[PDB]
């Protein structure tokens, strides 16, 4: 097993800009084969042996987002900086 | 006496973008001759008879801001959307 990865339970929600139903991140990361444990609002995720590409939280975020589907991410123009 | 005017105690602070010291609004409005009573977080302000220009909370905001000095108002860029 690779080293474990720690990330906040709502990190995929923030990156995607979507409030996923509760348990979505934990369910999806287990679905792809990782061991997921809870410590407050922080998940400790140990990827499976066949997923050496999962090394940091950003990798985990892609798994949740692609399985939930990118079509649920809304189109929200960010505010204009004072260019 | 003109009709009384109800205004939140922090209204001038919000419009100025400045956190004035405690009691600033009540002190300035009493200086210009108004009768000021406190109802929790809401002021009831009765302007003096020589100030018929004071009819709305915005009129009272101008009194506080001009006497505190507009130079204390900071310079921050607004959050304009993408045009
Ligand atoms: Mg990936
Ligand atoms: Mg005025």
């Amino acid at each position: 097993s690779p080293p474990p990865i720690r990330m906040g339970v709502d990190v995929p929600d923030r990156i995607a800009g979507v409030a996923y139903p509760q348990g979505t991140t934990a369910r999806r990361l287990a679905q792809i084969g990782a061991v997921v444990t809870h410590d407050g609002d922080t998940l400790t995720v140990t990827p499976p042996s066949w997923r050496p590409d999962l090394r940091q939280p950003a990798d985990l975020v892609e798994e949740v987002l692609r399985l939930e589907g990118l079509e649920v991410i809304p189109s929200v123009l960010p505010p204009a900086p004072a260019g």
Side-chain angles (χ1 to χ4, degrees), chain A:
Chain A
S1 52
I5 304 167
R6 293 189 54 176
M7 85 163 172
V9 60
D10 68 337
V11 169
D13 302 61
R14 299 177 178 268
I15 296 304
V18 172
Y20 295 115
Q22 62 171 285
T24 295
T25 291
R27 189 184 78 87
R28 291 297 187 179
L29 293 184
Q31 217 174 5
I32 59 97
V35 177
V36 184
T37 70
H38 285 63
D39 190 5
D41 299 324
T42 295
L43 302 174
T44 298
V45 184
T46 302
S49 58
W50 66 86
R51 294 298 305 268
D53 56 304
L54 301 180
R55 305 171 221 84
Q56 36 192 335
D59 300 310
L60 305 179
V61 170
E62 179 176 74
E63 300 299 297
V64 179
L65 270 54
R66 74 185 179 92
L67 290 186
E68 290 296 296
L70 300 187
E71 334 82 49
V72 311
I73 301 178
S75 181
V76 177
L77 264 178

